[PDB]
Enzyme design. Structure first.
Site, short mmCIF file in Angstrom:
data_model
loop_
_atom_site.label_atom_id
_atom_site.label_comp_id
_atom_site.label_asym_id
_atom_site.label_seq_id
_atom_site.Cartn_x
_atom_site.Cartn_y
_atom_site.Cartn_z
N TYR A 151 3.79 5.06 -9.04
CA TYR A 151 3.93 5.37 -10.46
C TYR A 151 3.23 6.65 -10.89
O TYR A 151 3.30 7.02 -12.07
CB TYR A 151 3.46 4.14 -11.27
CG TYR A 151 4.27 2.97 -10.78
CD1 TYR A 151 5.58 2.77 -11.23
CD2 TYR A 151 3.79 2.12 -9.78
CE1 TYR A 151 6.36 1.74 -10.74
CE2 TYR A 151 4.57 1.08 -9.28
CZ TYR A 151 5.85 0.90 -9.76
OH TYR A 151 6.63 -0.12 -9.26
N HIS A 161 11.39 -6.96 -4.19
CA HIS A 161 11.17 -8.17 -5.00
C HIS A 161 12.46 -8.90 -5.40
O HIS A 161 12.37 -10.03 -5.90
CB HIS A 161 10.44 -7.82 -6.31
CG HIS A 161 9.04 -7.29 -6.13
ND1 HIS A 161 8.07 -7.94 -5.39
CD2 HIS A 161 8.44 -6.17 -6.63
CE1 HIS A 161 6.95 -7.25 -5.43
NE2 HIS A 161 7.14 -6.17 -6.17
N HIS A 208 1.99 -4.41 -3.60
CA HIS A 208 2.43 -5.75 -3.98
C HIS A 208 3.00 -6.51 -2.79
O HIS A 208 3.58 -5.93 -1.86
CB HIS A 208 3.49 -5.66 -5.10
CG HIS A 208 2.97 -5.05 -6.37
ND1 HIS A 208 3.13 -3.72 -6.68
CD2 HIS A 208 2.25 -5.59 -7.39
CE1 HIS A 208 2.55 -3.46 -7.84
NE2 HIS A 208 2.00 -4.58 -8.29
N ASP A 232 2.06 2.86 -4.33
CA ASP A 232 1.15 2.44 -5.39
C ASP A 232 -0.22 2.01 -4.87
O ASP A 232 -1.07 1.61 -5.67
CB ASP A 232 1.78 1.33 -6.25
CG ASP A 232 2.62 0.31 -5.45
OD1 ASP A 232 2.66 0.33 -4.21
OD2 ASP A 232 3.24 -0.54 -6.12
C1 LIG Z 1 5.12 -5.48 -13.32
C2 LIG Z 1 5.37 -4.76 -12.02
C3 LIG Z 1 6.02 -5.41 -10.97
C4 LIG Z 1 6.20 -4.80 -9.74
C5 LIG Z 1 5.75 -3.50 -9.52
C6 LIG Z 1 5.88 -2.89 -8.16
O1 LIG Z 1 5.53 -1.73 -7.94
N1 LIG Z 1 6.36 -3.69 -7.21
O2 LIG Z 1 6.41 -3.26 -5.89
C7 LIG Z 1 5.13 -2.82 -10.57
C8 LIG Z 1 4.94 -3.44 -11.81
N2 LIG Z 1 4.33 -2.77 -12.84
C9 LIG Z 1 3.86 -1.41 -12.65
C10 LIG Z 1 3.72 -0.64 -13.95
C11 LIG Z 1 3.08 -1.21 -15.04
C12 LIG Z 1 2.95 -0.51 -16.22
C13 LIG Z 1 3.47 0.77 -16.34
C14 LIG Z 1 4.11 1.34 -15.26
C15 LIG Z 1 4.24 0.64 -14.07
K LIG Z 2 2.98 -5.02 0.70
ZN LIG Z 3 4.45 -2.16 -5.77
#
Ligand SMILES: Cc1ccc(C(=O)NO)cc1NCc1ccccc1
Ligand SMILES: [K+]
Ligand SMILES: [Zn+2]
Ligand SMILES: [K+]
Length: 401
Positions: A315, A141, A180, A271
């Site tokens: 996560y 990102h 994502h 994820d």
């Molecule tokens: C806001 C956000 C932006 C990007 C990603 C991600 O995994 N991007 O690949 C993940 C999150 N949030 C995941 C999250 C949310 C709450 C607690 C722990 C992880």
């Molecule tokens: K992707």
């Molecule tokens: Zn992600």
């Protein structure tokens, strides 16, 4: 040869962030617990001969002012006093806030992923390894002058840049399996036909980051000489291994046929697992219902193209290690032709107790719009081939779908 990035200082830095904690240690210690380390070539992270050399490498993509600001953020968080009002405004102008906060090692942490993935690219370029794994990288990102989504420096963009600049031309296919949309990588190569990007992901109103879908609206797909070179497949919540596999399988095979890449780079954010706290997709790590992830990696590796495999999101830390351990074993099998027998039970090791209460390698889970997307994507690939004067069998690629 299959390589993997690690090292003692690398492990400390990869474990120093508030968001991802000790995830990288769980991953590497489970891989070690299953006796895969002797099968793998350790790839040491890159180090530089001066501060000027480091800046020259990172500012191949990122602006000097952003790099300066990220270094200053680390310095400020290594002192007790809070930021001044002028320092808050500076950090806000680079989105170094909210989702991407400062912490005492934020710059060393971010740089480490860059060091790992640049070394992985060099190992592929010099043909030391056929595949290299970096479970410390994959931060898709981050933008030229902006942190995003807990990504501070885009190690992926910098690795790809090293690959395309190593050269009847060098082409890179980037495959983003994260939940994502891989917006930062897509944007970096929006005008470049030699780096084709392909992201599969969830998209829905209000869901991060918002791109990778309809924008009556239409799909954007690159610009200038990069027109038609950014591919996207957004999928609704709830998809399982088989449907996700059938959704992307023919696209992957047709991208390889038509583009004929010199290198493949895969982001393998975990994820999408059914047990991730996002609870969006329903993929597994099962290996006989076959894990969507293992289906995709096996297909990509069957092409026999030098390949970089990176981490990303994920996560649920023990389930992310369960997945990436199976990906690591599968890569060894396909590349070396050497069967890997993984016990169904988590071996005893330092983090054994994190895999409770069950201690199994399998994750704890009980398992028309796609056809229109396929029609659209196949027309885009044809347009991409036309514009770039590439030779391909339209009948054979059409059959794939
Ligand atoms: C806001 C956000 C932006 C990007 C990603 C991600 O995994 N991007 O690949 C993940 C999150 N949030 C995941 C999250 C949310 C709450 C607690 C722990 C992880
Ligand atoms: K992707
Ligand atoms: Zn992600
Ligand atoms: K592109």
């Amino acid at each position: 040869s299959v390589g993997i990035v690690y090292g003692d200082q690398y492990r400390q830095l990869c474990c120093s962030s508030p968001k991802f904690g000790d995830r990288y240690a769980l991953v590497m210690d489970l891989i070690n617990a299953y006796k895969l380390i002797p099968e793998l070539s350790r790839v040491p992270p890159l180090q530089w001969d001066s501060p000027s050399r480091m800046y020259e490498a990172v500012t191949a993509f990122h602006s000097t002012e952003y790099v300066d600001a990220l270094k200053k953020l680390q310095m400020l968080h290594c002192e007790e006093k809070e930021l001044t009002a002028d320092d808050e405004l500076l950090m806000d102008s680079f989105s170094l806030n909210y989702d991407c906060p400062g912490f005492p090692s934020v710059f060393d942490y971010s740089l480490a992923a860059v060091q790992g993935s640049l070394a992985a690219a060099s190992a592929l370029i010099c043909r030391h390894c056929e595949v290299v794994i970096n479970w410390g990288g994959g931060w898709h990102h981050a933008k030229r002058s902006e942190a995003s989504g807990f990504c501070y420096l885009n190690d992926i963009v910098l690795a790809i840049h090293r690959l395309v600049s190593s050269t009847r031309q060098t082409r890179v296919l980037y495959v983003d399996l994260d939940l994502h949309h891989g917006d930062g990588v897509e944007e970096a190569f929006w005008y470049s036909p030699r780096v084709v990007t392909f992201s599969v992901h969830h998209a829905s109103p209000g869901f991060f980051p918002g791109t990778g879908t309809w924008n009556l609206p239409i799909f954007l797909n690159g610009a200038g000489r990069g027109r038609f070179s950014a591919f996207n497949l957004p999928l609704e919540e709830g998809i399982n291994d088989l449907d996700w596999s059938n959704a992307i399988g023919p696209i992957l095979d047709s991208l390889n046929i038509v583009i004929q890449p010199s290198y493949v780079v895969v982001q393998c954010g975990a994820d999408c697992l059914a047990t991730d706290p996002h609870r969006i997709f329903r993929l597994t790590n099962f290996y006989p219902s076959l894990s969507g992830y293992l289906y995709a990696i096996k297909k990509i590796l069957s092409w026999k193209v030098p390949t970089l495999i990176l981490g990303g999101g994920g996560y649920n830390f023990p389930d992310t290690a369960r997945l990436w351990t199976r990906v690591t074993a599968l890569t060894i099998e396909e590349v070396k032709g050497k069967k890997m027998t993984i016990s169904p039970e988590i071996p005893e090791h330092s983090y054994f107790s994190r895999y409770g209460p069950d201690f199994e390698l399998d994750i704890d889970y009980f398992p028309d719009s796609i056809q229109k997307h396929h029609r659209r994507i196949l027309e885009q690939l044809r347009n991409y081939a036309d514009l770039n004067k590439l030779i391909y069998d339209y009948d054979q690629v059409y059959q794939l779908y």
